[PDB]
Structure formats: C-alpha cells, structure tokens
Amino acid sequence: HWGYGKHNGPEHWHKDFPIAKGERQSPVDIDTHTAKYDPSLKPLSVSYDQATSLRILNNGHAFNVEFDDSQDKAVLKGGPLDGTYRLIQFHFHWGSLDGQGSEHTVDKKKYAAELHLVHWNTKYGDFGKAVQQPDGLAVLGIFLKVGSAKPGLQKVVDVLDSIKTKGKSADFTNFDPRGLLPESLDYWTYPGSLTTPPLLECVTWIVLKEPISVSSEQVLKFRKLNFNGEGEPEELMVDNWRPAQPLKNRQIKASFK
Ligand SMILES: O=C(O)Cc1cccc([N+](=O)[O-])c1
Numbered sequence: 162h163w164g165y166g167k168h169n170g171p172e173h174w175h176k177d178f179p180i181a182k183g184e185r186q187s188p189v190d191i192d193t194h195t196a197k198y199d200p201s202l203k204p205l206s207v208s209y210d211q212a213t214s215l216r217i218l219n220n221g222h223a224f225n226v227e228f229d230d231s232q233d234k235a236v237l238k239g240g241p242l243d244g245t246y247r248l249i250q251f252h253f254h255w256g257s258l259d260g261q262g263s264e265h266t267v268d269k270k271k272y273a274a275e276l277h278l279v280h281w282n283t284k285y286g287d288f289g290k291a292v293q294q295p296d297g298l299a300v301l302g303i304f305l306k307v308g309s310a311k312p313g314l315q316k317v318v319d320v321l322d323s324i325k326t327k328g329k330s331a332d333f334t335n336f337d338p339r340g341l342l343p344e345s346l347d348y349w350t351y352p353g354s355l356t357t358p359p360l361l362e363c364v365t366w367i368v369l370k371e372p373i374s375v376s377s378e379q380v381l382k383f384r385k386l387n388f389n390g391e392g393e394p395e396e397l398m399v400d401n402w403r404p405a406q407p408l409k410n411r412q413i414k415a416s417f418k
C-alpha cells in the first residue's frame with residue numbers, strides 16, 4: 162500500500178519490488194551535454210488521426226485518459242522503435258508547486274508536470290503481455306511549463322471535478338491527443354521502466370525536448386484531485402512523481418544536434 166508519502170513513497174518501494182534497485186529504472190536526469198546524437202535514429206511517426214478516447218479514470222495515483230487499443234487507430238512508430246506501438250492511455254505527473262512535478266529532469270531542471278503517452282508493442286498482442294517484455298512499451302514524454310494556457314488541455318481540465326476521488330471515472334469521448342504535442346518532435350531516448358510499482362523494465366522512453374506551456378490555472382486544477390476515495394480524509398493528489406534514478410550502464414541518445 163504504496164504511495165508518495167514519507168511512509169510509503171519511492172524510497173520504500175524496493176521492499177515490495179526489488180526491481181526498484183535494478184539496472185534500467187526510470188526516470189533519469191537527462192544530461193544534455195552528454196547525450197549523443199545518433200544518426201541511426203529513423204524519423205518519429207506519431208499517427209493519431211483515428212484515435213478513439215473512451216474514458217477518464219482517477220486510479221488513486223493519477224488520472225488516465227484511456228483509448229480504444231483494439232485496433233491500430235493511434236500508433237507510434239519510427240525513432241528508436243522497431244515495429245508498431247498502439248496508444249492505450251495518457252496520464253500526467255505533477256507537483257505541489259510549479260517548481261517541481263516532472264519525473265525526468267533536464268540538466269537537473271524540474272518542470273511543473275510531465276505528460277506520458279503510453280503505447281504497447283503490437284507484436285505482443287495486448288498490454289499485459291507487453292509489460293513482460295524488455296521492448297514492450299514506448300512512452301512519449303512531454304514536459305509542461307507554466308505560462309500560456311494550452312487550449313487542447315482544457316477539455317481534460319474541465320472534467321476533473323467529476324473524477325475527484327480514487328476510483329471515479331467519466332466518459333471522455335472525442336478527445337484529440339494531437340492538441341497536447343509541441344511543435345518539434347526532437348527527442349532523447351533511453352531504455353527504462355515504469356515509474357510506479359511494479360516498476361517493470363519494459364519501456365523505451367522517448368522524451369521530447371520542447372515543453373508545452375500550460376497556464377497556472379490549468380495546473381491548479383490538477384492539484385484539486387484527491388488520492389483518497391470518496392468518504393475518506395482528503396489528501397490532495399500532488400507530487401506523484403518518482404525522483405531521478407541512477408543511470409547505471411545506459412546511454413541517452415539524441416535525435417538532434
Ligand atoms: O510509469 C508510470 O507512470 C506508472 C504506470 C503504472 C501503470 C501503468 C502505466 N502505464 O504505463 O499503463 C504506467
């Protein structure tokens with residue numbers, strides 16, 4: 162019964178999941194000067210035209226916007242990836258304050274939040290099977306800074322009062338995730354893991370260099386969510402980020418010079 166606190170936070174997770182101290186854990190700090198430009202990188206293809214959003218769920222640690230992943234409707238390919246990866250959900254990690262919230266850091270800089278678009282490798286047939294493989298998932302990570310509003314985020318922000326507490330869901334159809342992407346698809350990539358229990362080492366991370374801008378008001382609304390279930394004492398859903406983990410024997414590659 163894990164979480165983000167003093168008593169059950171990241172620094173405790175290893176007792177239940179020894180893989181917490183493994184060789185390819187996420188997130189990491191991205192040292193921009195040491196990431197090497199890789200000319201082998203094939204270009205990134207994000208194909209979201211046919212995406213079908215279904216539902217938004219407060220899962221007790223974040224909220225997930227879920228997609229129909231029963232056909233190739235929203236797929237990631239190219240980049241460092243071999244084969245086709247299907248979008249299943251996106252979520253965010255965020256802070257109690259604008260000065261922290263992202264999981265990845267860039268030369269030790271923390272962003273206010275980070276968006277994760279989660280995709281699974283179609284060669285494994287379903288998400289559950291994919292998470293058991295070293296190349297099972299591809300997560301596209303996008304940093305959020307506070308400034309101008311992101312218009313394409315507002316639909317997400319406005320439904321959050323309907324999913325305040327753990328276990329609540331709401332219909333969330335016709336959402337276009339293209340409206341959450343920055344202009345450039347320049348990226349860093351490295352092999353890593355999920356950043357919550359069970360911490361599976363199944364992720365190819367693709368972290369975009371260009372952040373998106375969201376307004377202070379937008380992020381504030383994220384911070385009104387609750388970790389707790391309805392009828393339990395209120396604990397604001399903030400600081401649901403795992404800190405940077407040791408890079409160990411990995412290299413971060415850049416798609417750009
Ligand atoms: O890495 C995370 O943000 C945690 C996490 C936990 C469970 C599933 C997830 N997913 O990638 O579908 C992600």
Ligand code: NI
Pocket residue numbers: 162163
């Ligand atoms: Ni538990």
Ligand code: NI
Pocket residue numbers: 252253254277356
């Ligand atoms: Ni995540």
